[PDB]
Amino acid sequence: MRKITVLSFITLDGVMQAPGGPEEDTSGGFKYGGWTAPYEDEVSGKIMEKQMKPADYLLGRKTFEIFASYWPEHADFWPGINDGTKYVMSKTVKKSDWKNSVFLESLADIKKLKNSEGSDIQVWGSGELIQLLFKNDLVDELWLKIFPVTLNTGKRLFGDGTIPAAFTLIESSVTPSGVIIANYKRAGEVKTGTV
Amino acid sequence: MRKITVLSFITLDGVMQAPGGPEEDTSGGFKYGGWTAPYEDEVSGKIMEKQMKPADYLLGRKTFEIFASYWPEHADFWPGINDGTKYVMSKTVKKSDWKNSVFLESLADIKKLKNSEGSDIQVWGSGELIQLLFKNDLVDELWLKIFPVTLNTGKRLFGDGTIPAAFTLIESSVTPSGVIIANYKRAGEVKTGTV
Ligand SMILES: NC(=O)c1ccc[n+]([C@@H]2O[C@H](COP(=O)([O-])OP(=O)(O)OC[C@H]3O[C@@H](n4cnc5c(N)ncnc54)[C@H](OP(=O)(O)O)[C@@H]3O)[C@@H](O)[C@H]2O)c1
Ligand SMILES: NC(=O)c1ccc[n+]([C@@H]2O[C@H](COP(=O)([O-])OP(=O)(O)OC[C@H]3O[C@@H](n4cnc5c(N)ncnc54)[C@H](OP(=O)(O)O)[C@@H]3O)[C@@H](O)[C@H]2O)c1
């Protein structure tokens, strides 16, 4: 059994669409692509150069294709994404000229990939696929970065597949720009009481 | 002009409904009332004290009525809510047995109260009213306690009134129970660039 970590950049109101640039994802006429862009300092770069250490990867086709247009040319900066196997969930794509790309089609294939032997799995972007991972409680860990911004519209990290669940805060951090790094571990069922 | 702070307990996916107990709010058949219970600790109380400072208050009718059913009988623990004026939005309730309760009926009234002279306004609970405040950009600070839990269903702090807007993280801490205190100042507009 492999660990599955979801890593995500979200706004205060949990919007995850198009962190990195104005055109990264225009679904809905989304106007705020690049909202992650004013909150990048050098200690943020060092916090997630360690988050970038080599692993295996699980991605939705759309996030795969956003990555495949850029990262094959920048293996200097992020070698992990280029060397590790990238398992990609898709029904419309079966091959890619990006090295070490495998294509899964089913919830069964994800479960086998998890049960199979090998390195821990990182999940970047992939909002729609994350919905399926959440709904089957396959997500073992959450690394989040919460930015001081609210954007009513936009694809969300906790969306359709969010289930009731509990977590442990493994560790946390803050950024000179005011970004909270939050690191949760899956922790069983939601507990209630009275205050 | 007065400083409208909004204070709110939210899950990781931003639900604020019924933090304190199982029957506190049962709209939609909400099964997770009291989800903040297992995360109450000592440090949390200390912060609660600085936020239980004598202020004026602005509340929605439902939150006022939940408060009025318990807090007038515990002026020792949380005085300020009994001593300060409570401005309550309603078109349903005109008077109350609680000392220092004023009843406002329009958006204009909330603005006039803001433009008035007096103590800085705290806002607790009041998701439906918060929506109107957000929509007209009357909220100036945000003190959030983010709890290590997810519950897909429930009333959301950032609901239909949320508007795109930037913030300045003025403070942050983590409790021994894994809750994230994060207070934000309102900071003008959303900036985008390219990473
Ligand atoms: N906040 C961040 O950290 C971050 C980082 C990078 C990107 N992003 C954003 O993530 C978003 C990526 O777009 P997206 O989330 O809408 O799509 P996606 O999850 O990346 O991929 C969607 C595609 O993957 C397949 N897929 C996903 N879920 C499936 C399921 N449950 N069952 C079967 N196939 C499934 C399908 O491929 P087929 O159509 O081929 O069948 C689907 O069309 C963008 O907005 C991107 O900007 C965020
Ligand atoms: N997470 C926390 O920190 C926290 C703390 C305490 C409570 N809560 C939760 O907050 C929720 C409070 O209930 P709620 O948010 O649904 O209602 P609410 O905002 O507390 O009050 C609803 C009533 O206030 C009036 N009102 C609100 N907005 C109005 C508007 N835009 N225009 C005119 N009148 C308006 C109306 O009164 P009339 O109908 O009388 O006209 C409305 O019916 C509960 O779920 C409670 O458990 C959360």
Tokens representing B184? 């934000």
Task: Determine whether the interchain pair B192/A148 forms a contact, defined as Cβ–Cβ distance below 8 Å.
Answer: no
Three-state SS at B34:
coil
Does residue A194 fall inside a structural domain?
no
Alpha helix ranges (H) inside chain A:
42-50, 61-68, 79-83, 107-115, 127-135
Task: Determine whether the interchain pair B150/A165 forms a contact, defined as Cβ–Cβ distance below 8 Å.
Answer: yes
- For A130, half-sphere exposure in the C-beta direction (CA atoms, 13 angstrom radius) is 24
Does residue A107 fall inside a structural domain?
yes
Per-window interface: B 133-192 vs A, CB < 8 A: 142, 144, 146, 148-152, 158, 162-169, 172, 174, 178-180, 182, 184, 187, 190-192
Element housing B170 (H / E): strand B165-174
AA letter at B195: V
| Candidate from B34, B152, B180 with C-beta closest to A164 | B152
Contacts of B187 (CB under 8 A, 6+ apart): A148, B166, B167, B168
Interface test with B, best of A149, A173, A181, A185 (most B CBs within 10 A): A149
Straight-line distance from the first to the last Cα atom of chain B, in angstroms, rounded to the nearest whole number: 39
| Candidate from B14, B166, B184 with C-beta closest to A14 | B14
Task: Determine whether the interchain pair A190/B33 forms a contact, defined as Cβ–Cβ distance below 8 Å.
Answer: no
Closest approach of A110 to chain B, Cα-based (Å) = 23
Task: Determine whether the interchain pair B192/A158 forms a contact, defined as Cβ–Cβ distance below 8 Å.
Answer: no
CB neighbours (10 Å) of residue B164? 18
CA distance B147 to A166: 9
Contacts of B3 (CB under 8 A, 6+ apart): B120, B121, B140, B141
Q: Give the DSSP per-residue string, B143-154.
A: EEEEESEE-SSS
Q: Which residue has the tokens 């029957």?
A: B23
Element housing B128 (H / E): helix B127-135
In residues, how long is chain B? 195
Adjacency order of strands within the sheet including A101-104: A101-104, A86-89, A56-60, A121-123, A4-10, A141-146, A180-186, A165-174, B149-150
Which atom of ligand 2 is the closest one to the Cα of B16? 1
Phi, psi values for residue B186, rounded to 5°: -75, 135
Does residue B193 fall inside a structural domain?
no
Task: Determine whether the interchain pair B22/A151 forms a contact, defined as Cβ–Cβ distance below 8 Å.
Answer: no
Question: Is any ligand 1 atom within 6 A of the Cβ of residue A60?
Answer: yes
Nearest CA to ligand 1 atom 30: A129
CA distance A136 to B167: 35
Whole domain around residue A65: which residue ranges?
4-186
| Candidate from B174, B180, B192 with C-beta closest to A32 | B192
Question: Is any ligand 2 atom within 6 A of the Cβ of residue B91?
Answer: yes
Does residue A192 fall inside a structural domain?
no
CA distance A137 to B126: 32
Does residue B191 fall inside a structural domain?
no
CA distance B86 to A84: 59
Tokens representing A100? 């070490």
Question: Is any ligand 1 atom within 6 A of the Cβ of residue A11?
Answer: no
Residue B150 belongs to a domain with what CATH number?
3.40.430.10
Residues of B with CB below 8 A from A187's CB? 148
Contact present, A176 and A43 (Cβ < 8 Å)? yes
Does residue B33 fall inside a structural domain?
yes
Number of domains in chain A: 1
